[PDB]
Amino acid sequence: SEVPMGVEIVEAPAVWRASAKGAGQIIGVIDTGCQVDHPDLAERIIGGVNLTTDYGGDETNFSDNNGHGTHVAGTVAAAETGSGVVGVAPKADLFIIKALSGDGSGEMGWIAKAIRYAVDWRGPKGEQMRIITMSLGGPTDSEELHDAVKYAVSNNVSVVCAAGNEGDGREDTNEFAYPAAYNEVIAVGAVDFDLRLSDFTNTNEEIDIVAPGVGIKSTYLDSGYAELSGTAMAAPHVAGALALIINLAEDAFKRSLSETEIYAQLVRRATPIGFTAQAEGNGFLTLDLVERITGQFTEKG
């Protein structure tokens, strides 16, 4: 089906109805930018920015030299179309922030302003962003990346990061990457479709959750489709999951929720597997877990 397996095990379809499919949420994608014209993405993308000196400092060209950030974006919100793929939140909107280059590398300061950009951003109506996603990592702790992050988190924005693919198969070796390594962030590691712990996934004391990250079919360059692998692919499932969660929990609680409140709601939709918390964090993302533990039986007409 139009739906990939990762969007499936994560249980997004079980909650689309109650979540309005992510409708009304704007997700910032910080990556190598995006193919704006891909049929599976064009009505999701409502804008973007270029902060690399790719295309020579060209502030408004945020298309994709790599293919990476096109992939990630599909996982977050590839729309339903009969065609290709659907993302965890096919009614959420994507703001593209190209802060990586065609070589897939970026300088700490490209990231930091990307974060700030998205927080400080507004669009026509005053439509602001609530989730940001970054399937990208750096071995280096520079403060003020930290600060951009803390800037975000305390203006009720949720920050979702790939954990890093610099690890072995020991839960007990711990390997870090930034910004996933900061506490304020939602740091996502990777498992495959058999919930086996992918080898490359960084383990540490700051991992929040894991999601599918092996052979993820999603939107590719030149209106294509490709299967990539990495914690870069895990991260966006939890990015989308958050648009669902905000909607369905703001319904239920009948008000706005804090960053804190959102995180708690994410975490209660996580199911431990058999790995340590340094490896799986709070568990694997199971978006229907709350319904399932509650088991009300309702009429059917």
Binding site for its own copies (CB under 8 A): 183, 205, 252-255, 258-260, 263-265, 267-268, 270-274, 276-278, 282-283, 289-290, 293-294, 296
| Least distance in angstroms from the C-beta of 50 to Ca ion | 35
| Least distance in angstroms from the C-beta of 95 to Na ion | 20
**Which residue, judged by CB position, is nearest to Sr ion in the bound state?**
208
**169 DSSP β-pair partners:** none
| Least distance in angstroms from the C-beta of 146 to its own copies | 15
Does 199 bind Ca ion (CB under 5 A)? Our answer is: no
- Choose between 1 and 260: whose C-beta lies nearer to its own copies: 260
| Least distance in angstroms from the C-beta of 67 to its own copies | 35
Choose, by CB under 5 A, the member of 83, 105, 140, 155 that binds Na ion. 83
Binding-site partner at residue 294 among Na ion, its own copies, Ca ion, none, CB < 5 to 8 Å by type: its own copies
SS (H, E, C) the chain: CCCCHHHHHCCCHHHHHHHHHHCCCEEEEEECCCCCCCCCCCCCEEEEEECCCCCCCCCCCCCCCCCHHHHHHHHHHCCCCCCCCCCCCCCCEEEEEECCCCCCCCCHHHHHHHHHHHHHCCCCCCCCCCEEEECCCECCCCCCHHHHHHHHHCCCCEEEEECCCCCCCCCCCCCCCECCCCCCCEEEEEECCCCCCCCCCCCCCCCCEEEECCCEEEEECCCEEEEECCHHHHHHHHHHHHHHHHHHHHHHHCCCCCHHHHHHHHHCCEECCCCCHHHHCCCEECCCHHHHHHCCCCCCC
Decide the pairing of beta strands 224-228 and 216-220: antiparallel
Does 40 bind Sr ion (CB under 5 A)? Our answer is: no
Does 280 bind Sr ion (CB under 5 A)? Our answer is: no
Binding-site partner at residue 83 among Na ion, Ca ion, its own copies, none, CB < 5 to 8 Å by type: Na ion
Choose, by CB under 5 A, the member of 31, 40, 208, 280 that binds Sr ion. 208
Does 203 bind Ca ion (CB under 5 A)? Our answer is: yes
Q: How many residues bind Na ion (CB under 5 A)?
A: 4
Q: Pattern 165-194, binding to Ca ion, x per CB under 5 A?
A: --x--x--x---------------------
Binding-site partner at residue 203 among Na ion, Ca ion, Sr ion, none, CB < 5 to 8 Å by type: Ca ion
Stretch that binds Na ion, among 78-86, 169-177, 241-249, 278-286 (CB under 5 A): 78-86
Contact predicate 74/122, CB 8 Å: no
Q: What residues line the site for Ca ion (CB under 5 A)?
A: 167, 170, 173, 203
By CB under 5 A, name the binding residues for Na ion: 40, 81, 83-84
